[model samples]
Target: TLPPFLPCELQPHGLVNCNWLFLKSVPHFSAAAPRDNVTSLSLLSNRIHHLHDSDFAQLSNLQKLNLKWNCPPAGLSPMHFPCHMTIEPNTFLAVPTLEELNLSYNGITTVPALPSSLVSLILSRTNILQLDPTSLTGLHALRFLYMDGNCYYKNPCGRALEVAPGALLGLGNLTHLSLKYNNLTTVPRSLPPSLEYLLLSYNHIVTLAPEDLANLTALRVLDVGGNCRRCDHARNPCVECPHKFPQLHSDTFSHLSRLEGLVLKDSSLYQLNPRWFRGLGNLTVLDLSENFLYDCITKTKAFQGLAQLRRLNLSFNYHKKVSFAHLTLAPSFGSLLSLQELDMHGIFFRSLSQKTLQPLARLPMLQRLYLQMNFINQAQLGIFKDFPGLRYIDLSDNRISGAVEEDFMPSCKNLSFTLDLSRNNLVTVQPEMFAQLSRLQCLRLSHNSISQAVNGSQFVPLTSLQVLDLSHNKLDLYHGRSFTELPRLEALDLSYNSQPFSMRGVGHNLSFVAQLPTLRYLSLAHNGIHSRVSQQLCSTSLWALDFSGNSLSQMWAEGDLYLRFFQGLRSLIRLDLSQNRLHTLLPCTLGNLPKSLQLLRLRNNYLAFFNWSSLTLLPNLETLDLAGNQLKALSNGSLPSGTQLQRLDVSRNSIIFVVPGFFALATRLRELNLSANALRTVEPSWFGFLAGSLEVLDVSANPLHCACGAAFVDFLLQVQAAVPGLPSRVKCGSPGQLQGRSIFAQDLRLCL
Candidate 1:
């Protein structure tokens, strides 16, 4: 007899997934039943051996089918017994309208006669080792085909899959094809000229000439990285054909005028040929990174042909001891008039001044500049101030002692949107260094030793700085009004900045922090501040306050700072108070939180109980994470009534008992995580209210008892669909006959 529908959930979207069910054949689905009009069916990791033409005869409108690893190769898993799978010639003739099919990691050795209506196909990591013209004969509507990892270094084949000449020329409508990890020696012959995206990376391709892409002018993205020949590296040295290195011919990309993005990284290319790119005028992005293009950048011109080039990634091309000093840049660099971004990160430049970057001034519209990881002691920001389109500059990891006024240009009136000056070993930060950058919006100054008092003078110049990242530093706010001059400073990160003094509440409070009326997001985590919770710790306009990771349990364990604790934050929305050893919060622990508070994080705490009444004070509470707590049980007191609580995470708690209708009042609950909790079984009443509304539910790692009869197993089947991998993750913990077995196991079903 056929398996009773395989216990698969007939989802609203018509998706029936019976993955890893150990089924040897397709189930007898109801014929033409409106409810059985499945759009997608997944039978992945099953033990199916053969497919008949009538297996899917009823699923006439099926669009997607995933049969990955019906019988996986040797030892994929101890349970996946080997099976030689085969399909009848007319297997897919029933579901002729199927749009997508996945047959990866299977025993199929050749591409079968697929439906002509298929738009996407995946045969990756299979036993398909050879390809001829007949491999893909009638897939006329196929637009996306991915055949990666079929041969090269895979189970059956240890080398590239053989593709006969013109094998794919019949796929006239195919626009995108990915053949990665196939270990091809050269570009396949007679590629479909209609292809737009071709990804042949992570292979051993050696040759790329004009004939490789003769008439493929419709190609928009060509990715051949990781296959570019390498020479300098000690091991895996290149062949070093007549050319100095793996150099492409000038006419290699000549015919493809429509090429918009090209990736040639990891190829030890020398002297980037400008003649090669002069033909493709529409090239907007050129990534020659991880190649030897320093000499082409410092003393030559390789981007001359493209006037519309918008982004150039020449980063990660390092040099021995050469700095872009003294030598004037080639005049050919001025060809990219429309270039917007130039990334020089990891090029290991010793010094970069106006002399080394004057030619870049010709790029009038260049906007973003990336110069991170350069060993520059002093930065002369002279030429960049003149470019009107210049808005962002990243000079991270320059290892400078301090940024003084002398390092900056005298006349600085640039319209910068961001300035990332982080991780440069900065000990002290002078606000005057950013005084002239009034238009700057975001400043990332983290991962440094910036130790100083809360002073508005340093930031008074940045009149429009909105986001400031001062995390991973040593600071003192020995304190408000310090940031009063900056009007737009909204987000500030001071996490991981543990100071020596008692700035928690003593000499210098968060006065400088609490006085910012416009600050929306503020983080003071892991600062070692054993400060007490109070209204004074927050500002009136604060939106999100992450005061976690501080030794806050010490003060709260005794008592709260009293009523109206969060009343000061009128617009506060998110308050994270996790990672504290909180045992029992006082009746008025949260005090008077803003009605706008929606998300509350009390995770990783030692809370035995929480005042649910006080938490519901904020009517818009949408998300609450109480994981890693010491709560042993949860009744209606856990969440009494009305509040827009949508997602609740109570995983990693010591919860052993859950009263019926635990979160019945949480009408809008969508995602519920109760993993790792000490429980026998999830009571129906505890989750019955979330019947058609719950989108995600996790009940794993619980001491589940499956011997409670058919009703428990019935509820468990519902749990199976809610929590993915429930068959493998949910195990029966009781009943000696079914102990240590999956809830879906045959023996576990005998209890019914």
Candidate 2:
């Protein structure tokens, strides 16, 4: 019964995580449980390739050390130091009160003398670009320094970045500095006046110098968007941004008058010089999106002096037929007077008024608005109710139809927002297009071509809606309304509309989803549903029910498995029925589900015989997603005893074997995602009924067959310490002398 000493999983004051354990060495819990009163040690993705100096010499109160990503073991099969990780030269000098150290994407190459009581240091994508000055000689209390992606971009030691301007001038208490994707062509001029957040993004920095931020003046966030990027929506490798963009010096950033967030996105920069942001007086969020700056805001004044700017993204800066509301910018979108979020996404506006939006009338403190894909139509979507501090609106990918014309309406106030009109060309929606529009709380209208059949009051003025994404429309709700006159409907997607793209077929009649009184989640996914509809929404408040790809095995017939379809989802929680074609699992399909179901997704189905004695007619099944089925074997009763089945996936199956009481009556089966299966052998009492309450035994993408590898290497080292990350997750396919091998380097002598 010994299962007490939980390897490493503490957290709170003296943290101790122990990620993906396959750790080849080092882990003494230091001298009996939480020894050395550990103060944080994550050890992620392990196969730990050597880091000696006694591993943390009895952790003298170690302060945050995450050995980030010990790469190499997502199954290429090779672990004895193949993805490289060595460390050793005083492996962290006995955790001298180590203050944050991450060694990102570990494959280490340099900078190992750390722990000068280091105050945060993560060498992301560690292929170290030698920052000599004895490379961080005694970090004077380093303050968050993450030499990002070690350079020539997208690392693997592509090198090309050199640092050393006396290597960060001995961190005089540096403040958040991440030299991103380091192919840095310039900008490291001894920077370290205690800089306050400077993440030079995707480096190749073309030009910028008021003595390159003249000692940062305590800068406040400056993320240089992938140097010269925006190669027409870059696909990487495009740092060639020079067709005239180096005019930056107007005191470059005027000694950072406390700059507050600036990410020059995908810098293909073309004309945007408000005296190079003369003196950013507490600038607040400005991402010049995919920069070609459309004449830096339709011809100059580039957002006049940033008067306390508050979020503005000029998304995908115009080019093709540039109409963005006829861009006559009263000096750059009229200087946002403390605006609040505005990302004119692809603003090729096809219609707009209120005197063509009067250059957004000085923003005045607008709210979230991203007129997405701007080909707006349907009568300019009836005015933004004059932007009364609107909360969110993305006339999503426009050219809308069949709705959107409250004819200059505006009296209605309480603008509670969120409305996307997803990928449009909508075919129908009425009730006078959100007429008395009351607090439209989320209305996406997913992938429209909306074909509503016979409904009344299409969204009766949204009546304060609450999440309604008419998912991939063409909804032929069989006649009569669905979500009628919304009374705050909660979550309804009517998934992928029916029969070969709906002309009809939507469960014949759903009794208007039990009269939508605050409906709670429902999706007739792939609408050709049929288990004879109308169970009269069984007392509503339905919580989750995606009847996935309906064909429910060509319309039910395992005695029509009726509990009246779903009796009445009194708050059902998850019942997907994935790609239905279920071949067998009668017993009333677990007694017609919804006894407040607990997530059962029957994955891509044609289920080949899953009998579990009708799960004793639904014995609190928690999560059972039979992924891609055709179960070739898990023999004997499958699992039907005192089951409170917690989670079970059965990944892509064809399972070739599994005998032994199947699962000796899964008591509280934790999680067993037998990944992409077709197993060739493994029979130790079919997992010995996991009394160890299996947490997650995802035999990853299996083809496993170490000749039955002696009952899976002794049940993977006897519960492999409750398996959070069992020896880097198995990988020996089939014996060509144990192929890509790594079931802990396999060799437990195959069974007779």
Candidate 3:
């Protein structure tokens, strides 16, 4: 009898959401009318069992209460079914203006005094077991406390929630505390000295007793990571721990002296002793990354007393075979003078002489140096002139084959670096091998083995090179003075180099990329060019061109050299000739494309026709992907007059007659994918130039001639009110009054 008011959606400054409906209690809402000024109530996943202090004594403006995923009384079961919620300790004194409370996963066992004018409390995955120091006694203005996956003995209500060591003694104005993946073994002492962000990551914290964080001291970001190797303490039950790991003692963080970011990553740490960062002198980010610490990082001095360390993740620490002569004798982080980023990426070091960069040549303000996946092959000369403030150096997946020119000089002099020797084994780059990187700017020699013949002062003193990745190298040939001294090169990736050529030898190796004057993105995809790409070899600042997996059937096999290579790609703005072989494109091919072409990927080509007036020379063509082509009949001038197409992907083509001026002038067409085509009559005024910019219209598995015309079945009820998953992807591909229905349950006006 009380469930009437449960049909929710009541709002007027007073919200009510009967989430998931199978609600089991608390519904007689309208107490003294107007739902007693209800201020937000979501009985989420309800099965509710108890909470009667007169079940919300007239909500009295309850300010946000979501009984999250509630289920008790053995009703709805997917296991977690315990917390018969039972509140009645005046059950929240009846929401006296409750301010945010989400009893998460509700298999709750304790903590529930609630409402001291609460201000945010979400008990995450609760099976709460023992946190009674008056378990949050009347949450004095609580400020965010999401108890992490509460007390886990592999929860589903099995039991294992312990924290009664002054169970957060009256949350002294708590300020953000999330006990992550909780299974905590220690360090949960009376927090909240106005705590400033403390998320004990993936729990099972195995002790950090400097009197367990010597009373917060207003902590500033302290995450005790969890990779707990042992510590099962049910009162030391099966105790046997000399040291299989997990030991942090050195006065465990010597009492947070206003800590500023300290995360002991995946805590199964094996060794690190600079007196465990003795009191973290205002620590500036020290994430002892996934610890194993190769013998306290090559025999201790353990990062000398962190003199304001600025960001040091000894990445994936030592499992074995860690070289660079054991991090070239650890002891000095070159006096941490605010060190700037040094992540020894998966340390597997194999070579980089100068006594392996003389211990980072005393950190000369190290700026980003992630020696990517190592096995680095030889490199000695001037060894990065000892990091003169390196500007980013990621020796990408190493096995480096060569690079001599004093390995990029750089002894600090207006540095500009950004050099990532991509997947290595570089076969040859020599010729001033980046002539002392005069401010090298982005140079990732992609998947190496760079086949030679580059005598143009080999990247002539890199005059500020701007992105150049010799994509999957072994480049066949190219000389226009090999990039005529990279005049501010701007993005060039010779995709999967060398193969099927000739369009006059790929326009003489693309007139060496149209003599690079600020080249704009060019990737000769899977370099097997069946060229004819004329425009005297483009690069009038070309804007994106990836001649995809070229087979270009001998450059569109003779005649109009594929409209003379889209008329020399006039400043094209994205044109990926997707897996080309092109079977017919002629409306003068693309009439001389690049009216600043906007995305035109002929996906898996072998196109059937497509001369739509060469898309009116791409009047700013806006995305047109002829999906897996061989497009059948589109007809009526197909679509060209000043078209500003907005996404038209003739899906897995065989598209039967769309005809009617085939999208007139594409009126800014907005997504029309005649899906899995072979259509049967869809002249709904050729989609009235997409009624006010259609947002995706997929005529699924087409055969649509749904009992032909009754004004196209009332224009499919105005396209099923502008397509909302258009009646389950427009079904009816038949006639007999709509055979397998759902062209939106066609009653087609009783067959008109």
lDDT of 1 by residue, 255-305 (tens): 888899988876767677777786887789888776766766767767665
lDDT of 2 at 220: 90
TM-score of 1: 0.84
Candidate lDDT scores, in order, read 0.73, 0.70, 0.68
Residue by residue across 1-752, what tens digits does model 2's lDDT show?
Answer: 11122344564577677787667766664245646777788888776777889888777888888877775322222443446678778879777888888878766667888768888888877666678678888789888888787655345455567876757777789799888877877787777888899998877787877887776788899888868765554466565677776445666787788889888887777677677776788988989877766555656786776778888888877774456545444555666778788787785656645555566744657777777787767444446655666777777888767543411111112446877878878788766666645767777878887776646467777777777777777766554375677877777776887645444433466777777776667777787665545544564577777778887665666355444566577667777878877786657557866666767787888777777667666666677888888888777566776778778878898887877767767867778777668775445577565546775676665777765545665665666554443444555677777765555442632231
Displacement of residue 77 (Cα, Å) in model 3 is 35
The candidate that achieves the highest lDDT relative to the unseen native structure = 1
The model with the greatest TM-score is 1
True lDDT of residue 672, candidate 2: 77
Name every residue pair that clashes in candidate 1: 431-458, 478-508, 479-508, 479-509, 480-511, 480-512
- Model 2, residue 605: what's the lDDT? 80
lDDT (10s digit) by residue, model 3, range 534-632: 434556777787888886666766655455664565677787888877776655556566567788887887878766766766667788888988878
Candidate 3: where is the Cα deviation over 4 Å?
Answer: 1-177, 180-186, 189-222, 225-262, 265-286, 289-300, 303-562, 566-586, 590-752
Per-residue lDDT value at 412 in model 1: 18
